[PDB]
Design a protein around this ligand. Sequence first.
Ligand SMILES: Cc1ncnc2nc[nH]c12
Ligand SMILES: Cc1ncnc2nc[nH]c12
Ligand SMILES: Cc1ncnc2nc[nH]c12
Ligand SMILES: Cc1ncnc2nc[nH]c12
Ligand SMILES: Cc1ncnc2nc[nH]c12
Ligand SMILES: Cc1ncnc2nc[nH]c12
Lengths: 237, 237, 237, 237, 237, 237
Amino acid sequence: ATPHINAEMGDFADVVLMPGDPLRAKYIAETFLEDAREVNNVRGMLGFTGTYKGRKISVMGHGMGIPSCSIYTKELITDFGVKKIIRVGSCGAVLPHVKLRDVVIGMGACTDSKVNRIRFKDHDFAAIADFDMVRNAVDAAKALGIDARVGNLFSADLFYSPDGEMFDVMEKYGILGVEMEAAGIYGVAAEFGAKALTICTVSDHIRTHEQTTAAERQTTFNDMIKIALESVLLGDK
Amino acid sequence: ATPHINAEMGDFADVVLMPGDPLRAKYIAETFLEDAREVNNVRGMLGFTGTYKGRKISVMGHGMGIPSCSIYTKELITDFGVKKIIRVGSCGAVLPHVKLRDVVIGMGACTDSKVNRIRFKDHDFAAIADFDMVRNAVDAAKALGIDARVGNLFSADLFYSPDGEMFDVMEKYGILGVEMEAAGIYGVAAEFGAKALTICTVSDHIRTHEQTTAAERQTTFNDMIKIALESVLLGDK
Amino acid sequence: ATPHINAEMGDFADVVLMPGDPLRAKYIAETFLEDAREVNNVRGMLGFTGTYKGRKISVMGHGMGIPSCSIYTKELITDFGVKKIIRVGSCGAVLPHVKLRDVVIGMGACTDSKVNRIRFKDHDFAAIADFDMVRNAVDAAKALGIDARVGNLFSADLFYSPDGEMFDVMEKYGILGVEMEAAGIYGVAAEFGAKALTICTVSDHIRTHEQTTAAERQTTFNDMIKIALESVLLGDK
Amino acid sequence: ATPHINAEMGDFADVVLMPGDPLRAKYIAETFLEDAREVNNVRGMLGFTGTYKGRKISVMGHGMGIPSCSIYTKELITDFGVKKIIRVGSCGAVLPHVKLRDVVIGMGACTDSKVNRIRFKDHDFAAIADFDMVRNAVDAAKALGIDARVGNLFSADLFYSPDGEMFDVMEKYGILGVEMEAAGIYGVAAEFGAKALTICTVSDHIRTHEQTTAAERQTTFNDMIKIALESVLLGDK
Amino acid sequence: ATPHINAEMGDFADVVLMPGDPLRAKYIAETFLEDAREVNNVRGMLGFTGTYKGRKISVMGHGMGIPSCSIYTKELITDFGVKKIIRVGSCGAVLPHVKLRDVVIGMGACTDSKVNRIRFKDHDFAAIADFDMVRNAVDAAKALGIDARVGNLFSADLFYSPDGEMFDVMEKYGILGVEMEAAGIYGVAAEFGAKALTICTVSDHIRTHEQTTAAERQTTFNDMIKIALESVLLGDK
Amino acid sequence: ATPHINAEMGDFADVVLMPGDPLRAKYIAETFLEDAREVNNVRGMLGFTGTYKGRKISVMGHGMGIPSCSIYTKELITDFGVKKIIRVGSCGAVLPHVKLRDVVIGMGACTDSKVNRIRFKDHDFAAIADFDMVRNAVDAAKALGIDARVGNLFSADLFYSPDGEMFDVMEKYGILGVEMEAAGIYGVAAEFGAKALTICTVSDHIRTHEQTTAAERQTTFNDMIKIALESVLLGDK
Ligand SMILES: Cc1ncnc2nc[nH]c12
Ligand SMILES: Cc1ncnc2nc[nH]c12
Ligand SMILES: Cc1ncnc2nc[nH]c12
Ligand SMILES: Cc1ncnc2nc[nH]c12
Ligand SMILES: Cc1ncnc2nc[nH]c12
Ligand SMILES: Cc1ncnc2nc[nH]c12
């Protein structure tokens, strides 16, 4: 067991889907996994390991923000043999043509955090996802008839940012989604030798102001989870 | 209700104690509060409200990291009328003379994050606690016959930092403890006009390396909690 | 005509292959293009426009370093309707398993330059290539039976860097190739609304010290040019 | 003797009062101390030692700016056994509810200087005062009927700053006063393991020019000195 | 031979004039040098060696940008025994009183690049020319009856900068001209122990916007070249 | 009058000599000027005005550090019509071939201070002196048989810097002397359109402690003053 995960080598699959909310991980294990088994509950960060069309799969929340997910993704990679991490969460849109419920694949991740500068001697480190994983997700998406944009995300440290102007700069440079973890997960993966990918569903719109609503949430969310699970299968082949 | 808290104005007291672990919050409510009632469960971040010796008090977890605690404290202050926040957690030791089971009070907090620089035009903002709250905590500790150390804490973004040379620096400049939220909580308090304080017990010693396993460590964690509760009573006078 | 290119709207195709060396552009127009026509010679930066299997194509050098290529890629994009830029050059390897003559596709680009920080309010901008272009290049590569690694490149400002330690950091984070333009071309593309991709051939080895040699250069170089030209065709489909 | 102090060990007491202007050190010694003797005159920075109600105390000017005071506070601490330094001077205010002639105590000190970043691996160091010294001053003030405010100060490198928008940022974050030494002195104290405190009287209000007679000023200056001196006696208890 | 220069020790004189455009280099050789011979053609960066009034002199292009000129000047100094480098180019006007056809001498050079910070531990390194070379240039200009202005130049990484607010700043602090190499050439000279100087003629006015088209502008460019040639003669004495 | 100078327009000449220690301004005036009158005594920073061979000249101390001298040089320039400022002081050396008591002229000044970055949009500003003043001093030195060196100086914020490795970096880049004001004074001069120069004598050698009598020092100090004064007369020609 590690400082933040009470489990043992073997309890997790080599791939792990990770939403921010611990209750979402649970819902996922109950809606997409067979023989779901709870493997962790320290600090309430629920973790599950089951099967999907025969494939062993794990799902566990990672909390909010870079510092939080870095801890879990790190422990999973060094003490439980996890090879692939797949973040499945929500994000805020800045581009007018990017509407709600839209699915975005984070090929890269911009951030205003200092974690990567500390790792890269104060220079610019391009936090990127594993190419094959991105490719898998795009193909699984087409096979499901679900749209998907591939590009840059922005991992912010402050959900309530005092710098309003920064959103215009984001828009100008084509940021597809604003969240709070991608840049950190790519840093950890690169540092500890693993692969990662971040997939997000456009919740609210930073401009228009309007979060998720009705039953559209679940359906769109299920599409994201579906895309992630199928991408793992295309990767095993 | 706010994006991360499903409650209404009044469900929280004007004073909230915040441990990092939501399970630790339930522990506080059931151990020290009377007539406790759960007021939040969003994302599993349990929040409770009850009374201590007749005073209305609230306790709620804030997750790990500056980005996480920044959201919760911000929403409490601007949407729930909270005026005081008291973080109660654990920290890693840096100074040789700082022994285990020592109660540390963070009058100030150094940090690795750039959240405060975003706020302060890229200059040095000295993240500090509220003076009266610090004094109340020192007096409450004395009344209980407990020796409290007041000084600087260090708030890191990476629990698993890639540079160990930084620990000598923290020691050279007198940092009493290493945790992950103080600097962020103080930035929020100053940004939105509220008051905050961080109290910690030393759970490990990055120096001689010393974990913890005894009824004695659990006795000191409770002393810290009693120090926080009693200090609010002193403040009301 | 623009300040650095004496030509007119229509002289360039909507796609342009760009090596660093002006003499290479010429060699390319003479070895892979039909009806090659010189369209520019200002400052000696030779530019050509011809045909490849029917497709209109242009090839022009961009000089050495971020400041140099930013100027040309900018003018091509705003005054000659260029839609896609494809850099084809050399790079130094840092990873032991990455040997000479190897072909690398730059999905992302790290840099120690300040150009992107100036554009992104001093935060971390992840300089990335267009996903489809990367995908096209990988497929064209498999079709030619030529190996190709997809990942991060490092765009350096100083060929003769005084910071030797930085190469160990590069290696640690998996940098596949060290060159001097990618990070800038991705910045310009994002700023002016175009698409770009950088493909490099591993020349010397920053560690072992041994640049190109014999006739292996041309053959491997021709493979790179072939991959780039075929990727454009897969993109038209 | 030291580069800037022509004296030997034992000439200075373990507690030193330091005003900005050197002419004030002469006034302090003849107005509050008994049996005073001169201990330094280098560069015209007069230094005196004597007693206040039987307590051995020294007083000497530190000049203007972080660099200047860092020279003196460093030499006093490592070469003359000084344990406590108390800066007594004036400051400009930015907060409306902070009246002219108010007494401000610096529990913390923000700054636009780079000295602390150079010391703290380019991270955020929270330059704070010794807590007991802060409470001593507060209680001495109360005992003298003088009410004082405790909070942040801002140590500027440029009295005539090119940026006027920073004062807005200061007001927003509750800065009580602007001067030019606290953050520097607090850094030195932490570097060599000593204790420090900065006390200031609002002499200017960077808002609407007010007016005060020369008599009022002298009266306020004496109050500040009394506070400093009585707080030392309280700390001895 | 070096990575970018195909010549042997002796092919270059101990003094090399360097214009940005290699075609401009051929122009210099054929217009002012006697018995000129091409000594380099790698990547099309033409270099020549001949004599001026009996003195052996060399002239060679350095490309656009700090990264480009840094390579060539470095290789000349460490592998070809070159002791002096004199850049002769054009610059954009900033100050209203700085008219077209004014010869500007860069005693110092501000910059946008971070190359010198990499060199100087992230501090401020004042990139300056060699004093004797500056004086020789002023005297040579006087002898020719030409008015030379000595001061600061600004070396930019982006000819097409995304911020125009920077031009007011350059004007406020007296920058005489804007180009793209001076700061880098001075860094190299200091790093490898050589001497350098940058001379420029104003080709445009970013102020009132003024290009150039007259036999008069070509007359001033030649005056600059004669100033550089004659100044070396004064130095030999 | 100004915040730090109790005098009116016309009291200071258009040229001001400024030593570090205020006691020296008294010596300069009685030793080199005729018909001297006192013009300032605030904070003990004595100011004098008089004539040297019919030339009206003023002298006054500027204190230690960038912050202090920035105060005085700013007020003299914008409130008393001062056109030229000449700092005369001492410095430590790092270069072996730079002997003790040598005369160094600062054509440029590096620094680890942040004042200029704050002025120059966080970019590199090359803090340089007025060229004519530099040549005047050189020629005055030659005329007096005194040989002087022209080059870079380093203006430190911390006399007792925590980093000892920076001195190696300084030596490598040819820094001639270390002091604490030049870069600051040069910034102010550029900000308000005036001229400045810094002249220093090597009083220390941060290498191997040497020795010099008190008589030798006085002799060297007078040489520096003569240079400064004669250079002013030359500039008038
Ligand atoms: C404004 C904002 N910032 C970061 N993550 C988010 N998810 C939704 N909205 C968000
Ligand atoms: C040992 C250690 N390192 C970094 N952050 C911590 N929080 C608690 N303990 C810690
Ligand atoms: C060392 C180095 N740096 C940048 N680009 C290169 N191409 C080959 N070697 C290189
Ligand atoms: C009024 C004022 N403004 C700025 N810095 C100061 N230091 C002391 N007093 C000051
Ligand atoms: C107008 C302009 N802007 C930036 N760099 C330049 N070099 C020459 N002219 C220039
Ligand atoms: C010897 C020495 N060292 C560092 N800074 C200085 N300023 C003046 N003299 C100095």
